[PDB]
Amino acid sequence: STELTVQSERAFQKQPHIFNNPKVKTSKRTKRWYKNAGLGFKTPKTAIEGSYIDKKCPFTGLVSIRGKILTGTVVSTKMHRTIVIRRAYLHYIPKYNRYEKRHKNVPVHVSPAFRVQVGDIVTVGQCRPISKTVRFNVVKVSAAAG
Amino acid sequence: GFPMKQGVLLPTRIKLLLTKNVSCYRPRRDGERKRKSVRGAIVGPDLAVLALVIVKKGEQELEGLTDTTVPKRLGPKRANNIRKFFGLSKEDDVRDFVIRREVTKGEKTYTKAPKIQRLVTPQRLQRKRHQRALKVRNAQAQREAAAEYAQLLAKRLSE
Amino acid sequence: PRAPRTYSKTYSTPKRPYESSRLDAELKLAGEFGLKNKKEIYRISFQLSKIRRAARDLLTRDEKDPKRLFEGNALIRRLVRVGVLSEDKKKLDYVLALKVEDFLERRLQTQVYKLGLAKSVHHARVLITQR
Amino acid sequence: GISRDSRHKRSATGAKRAQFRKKRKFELGRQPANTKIGAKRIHSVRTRGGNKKYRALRIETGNFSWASEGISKKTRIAGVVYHPSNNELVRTNTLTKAAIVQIDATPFRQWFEAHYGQTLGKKSKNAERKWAARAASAKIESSVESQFSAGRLYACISSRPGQSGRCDGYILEGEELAFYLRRLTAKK
Amino acid sequence: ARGPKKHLKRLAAPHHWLLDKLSGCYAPRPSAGPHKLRESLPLIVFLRNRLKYALNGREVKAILMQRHVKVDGKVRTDTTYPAGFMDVITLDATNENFRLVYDVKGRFAVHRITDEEASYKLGKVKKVQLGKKGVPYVVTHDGRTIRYPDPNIKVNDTVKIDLASGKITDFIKFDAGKLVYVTGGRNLGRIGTIVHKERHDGGFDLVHIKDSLDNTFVTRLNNVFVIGEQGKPYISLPKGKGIKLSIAEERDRRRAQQGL
RNA sequence: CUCUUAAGGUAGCCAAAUGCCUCGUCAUCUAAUUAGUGACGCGCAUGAAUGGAUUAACGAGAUUCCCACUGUCCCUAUCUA
RNA sequence: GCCCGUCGCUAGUACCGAUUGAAUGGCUUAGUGAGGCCUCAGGAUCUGCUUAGAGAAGGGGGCAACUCCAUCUCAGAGCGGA
RNA sequence: GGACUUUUACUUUGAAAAAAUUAGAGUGUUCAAAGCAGGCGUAUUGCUCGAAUAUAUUAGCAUGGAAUAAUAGAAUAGGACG
């Protein structure tokens, strides 16, 4: 529900091997490593001018996007830095030459770069086991309703 | 029938998990441990036999023992191990020192001897010569093609 | 763990066991071609059905169908090579009108007879099965 | 023994699971090397497919690096000060990654005062030539300088002593040191 | 299964060997080697199933143990050695030089090349890597690695190797037009130019193709093996040039060639 | 259908605090039960505000058994005022 | 003519039912806890390094003086390993 | 000229795609069930065609289509295009 003032956890929050010399006065108080995700996914401003950490962020972090690029609607933002996406479809029963509405809930990691709520069509991408349930990662976010 | 075991203490049979390089057990396959019975290390009256070894010799002679003496069976076989046995030095050529034993057939007796191992031979010295050659030759050749490529690379640029 | 040396059965008993009509016709056949039992007609009745089915299916397709032409003419070329289909009845329409005795006629049995050598199918029977 | 398998867990739905198979070795886990401070004691452990791991379970002296000054010196490691995971590690002085430990400062003293020719907050020709150039570059943080007076430096462990066998770390500089400093007077 | 498997049930073997159904429970099972065991060809199957130079599998070994056979110039003696595409095989004691190269069905045809040409082969590069000590290297489709390559050589480009020195001697790039051999899939055995490569980020680029008959087929980049220029092969193609004809056009070519 | 003497024991309940025979018969609990319980009922002599049957809760009421417990006992000993 | 229910005989089936009924399996609270594995120890027996004193060698190079490497033999004084 | 559906379902055609089984081409196991053989000849040092094809109705991937059926967009203008 809320993004900490970075140094909230008992461990110091920093990007691995991104060093800034104290003997060298600059502009930015802290350097910032980010990358381009791939498959033509544009990295957001928030992913750059931020001081959020998230070692599980697609950009700015230590994961990567390969496998399956999915899309479903947001159904639960109640967690912290991960949400629940619903994926609706239609199974085909040969016998009745007809279909039935099925659905799946797919847990996804949501970077602090995106500020997403229930509603919101979202574009997630597969990314190795982050954490038991979670296997995918928010990458692009289509609008809500207004 | 059970054997005493070094330093268990106790004067009674017990069952230990035994392993490789341990008395009272010869492993029938690699990594096979076996729960086997064993006798203590302390002398009781429940002993069938008791091996002793003589340290200091006593006053009188022991007929089966001190009196008689028995030879070793095998003599030295390694180069220096023959040298050490007779006390030779590095340049003494063992070949004419090795132990020979006579074997009688019926009417043609013959002798035999080991096969001085570790012995430095013309062949061995030839092998070290080859290894040396191959190493230096292959190194230079690997530097030949090294610079050869680096110049093939500049002409992907300078042109 | 070997390979299942495959197989299949050759005949097909009738759906209705006692048709005085059918049972008559079957007996007529068994006597003139000199057969041994009803199985020797079931064998051929069954063989006939696939053929008519094979052709029944090919005909439903649009003509000049790559599969229809190959699998049809291949069917027709075989049926003619044995003497069951007329030399110029080489159409799938003409194989659906094919009937049992066409096949039945071409047996060695009714050839040993049909050109001397025997002067009786029952004679022809024993002549074949005695080398 | 220990099994890192996920089968014994529940499903997210909350459903239980019947046991599918017995435990396989290729999902095993082992007990922690809880690496304490003391005379060097390391045992190894045969891992998957040949391969050695090094159970460092007693360590003095690790290899640390003054990051900004570009060098590294092997010190001694005094005790454990803080630990973001668990304070019990601190109390029993236990060396993990992300540990925060006090280390000797004298090897870092002997470098500074000889590299630059200065003393930390109280001849020859080419020696002076070098010092003169290296000057205007050799003033460091006062939050780091004043530490030398005590002879022990705040450092953070970046090795994994249960794995590598090394208790290597890096002396805390920047805001990182600033942060652990703040945490060190709120509680310790 | 507690470890690597060592048997091959004769039914689970690759069909394109054409081993019989009956006559035994097992097939040879390629040893570990240059080619993927499913994409390979044991020497036992060549020397008795494809050449009939042997009957027993015993007499296969007796031939091999005589060192009677080189593969790519090196004398191979493992009964079930896994030879493959672009390989040569040289039965010296009978002046025969082959080259395992594809049928027009999907099989390994008995292609006899000259006593020359067997002094080289081709190689599809798989990766181009910077090795250690700065040295660069390429890896070909038969587990050959050649250090110090032409900087131009990228992935998918083929490579002219010798056969007693390694060493690349010219090569072909992958662009439009080139002459291509399909090495697997529904079009295995076919030959044609290029027309198009339809790249797909994420995975799987397809490569449209056209033969010497204006028939356009498509496969996956993986299956494409460049072997030279339009109408200009860098090796001797087997009979039929891997052109592929329908079952219809097959049947006509049979009955016509049949008789006289 | 009949007689005494007005009716002729219904709904229920039982060897029940009411059953003689009787330590009733069957089942259950036990090694073994004139005990207990569940049943059966031509019930010497059950039975309907002379109240009948059921009943949660309550009981220093009567009765059976289990667990725990223990000098009640086997089998006695020792100590203190 | 058809036909309903009590009542009466025989056989079969399921149901209810004292028995704090019984059996088998799975999962389990509490208490107890084998074994091998990891670890603090222990140290039957083994053993590497170093040092002074002793006996016997050969010279790193001298008219008498000078001084290394290797090997092995017995009182010891240290610090290490299996 | 390459990329290009607001977001889909649908439909076309392909791709990756085990063998056996099934369907089915050739072949005279003497016939057939089978098998994957075999066929021709100076048969005294030979020649030669084969071991096809189709099927997968879910899902994924690639692709031609935009009818039918869903869906988003400018209303306090917090609009589009440059």
Added chain:
RNA sequence: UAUCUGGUUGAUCCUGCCAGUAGUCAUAUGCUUGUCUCAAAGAUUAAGCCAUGCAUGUCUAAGUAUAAGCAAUUUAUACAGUGAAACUGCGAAUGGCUCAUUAAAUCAGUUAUCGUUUAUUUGAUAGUUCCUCUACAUGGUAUAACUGUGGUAAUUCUAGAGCUAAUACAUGCUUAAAAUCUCGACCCUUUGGAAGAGAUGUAUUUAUUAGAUAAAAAAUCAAUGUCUUCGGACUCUUUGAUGAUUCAUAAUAACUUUUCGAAUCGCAUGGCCUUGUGCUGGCGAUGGUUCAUUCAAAUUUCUGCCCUAUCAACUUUCGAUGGUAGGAUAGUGGCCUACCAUGGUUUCAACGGGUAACGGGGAAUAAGGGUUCGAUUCCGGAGAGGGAGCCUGAGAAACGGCUACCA
């Protein structure tokens, strides 16, 4: 290969079942049984119990031969043929059997490893090791078989004393040229410069750095690099793969109970000149570190399961969903642990229950659609009386391995 018929009435037409009919890679049983081809076969009930035998061992020209083995001769006075035993190496994790467990598990098609391990095969890959007077014409110990002293009723039990090998065990030399670095005797004061001293294989661990790009111009601070026409100037200046990375790879400072860098074996018998058993030298074998290949493995994305609500809420017990750090693993991961939040699934059927449930390839039934079946020739899975634990090894939570409890 799109078919019906017999039975409710006195008779009729319907509803509607029962009964007949036909097949079954469908099992049993009965009666009968001549030939050819093909050949399933203790699945069902009891993954119930098992006498006895067998089913896993293995050697080349090429690791170890002092058999008091045999053949015998060798040119054989080190050995030399053949070779019991034993050591060393490799295999015993494949196969074969069964279907007990298992219902989102397994399995199938489809992905993923920018998330790991991999004996072996195949292709590559090593001049650096000591040190401010060193074995390299080759270091040091030990053990088996054997010998002899023995114990026990008993077994693939073994004790104590004596011997001797290695590609076993443990040690340990080696190689060219340049260059770049740090420390810096000293000299001469300027644009100032150095004499030689040490360091620089790979692997290990940690930090720092390079790994550039969409199109262009200056100003300075900091430390110092070429130059020229000694005033000041500086051009043609280098960098790979991916859709994407802290990638490949290189560099700097160091770290290390220091990984590897041939003390090995068979054939060959040649060539040089100062002629010394001097120097050079062929074809392999077996090793070896790192990468690649291969045979794999381990996790993994999407979609798909039979009956059931007389199962409606489930999950957080004592991890249930997530976050941060750590530990552990070959590695990702609530896999485990600390701390922190209260999340996670559900009428589109969760959760629970049943299955006489291993999944699939497939099988039976032929209008079509469907119905039923799949222990069982192939693939995947699992198990070896029940559980757990573990040694060895590349690989096993292995059972013709061990350890324990249970039966």
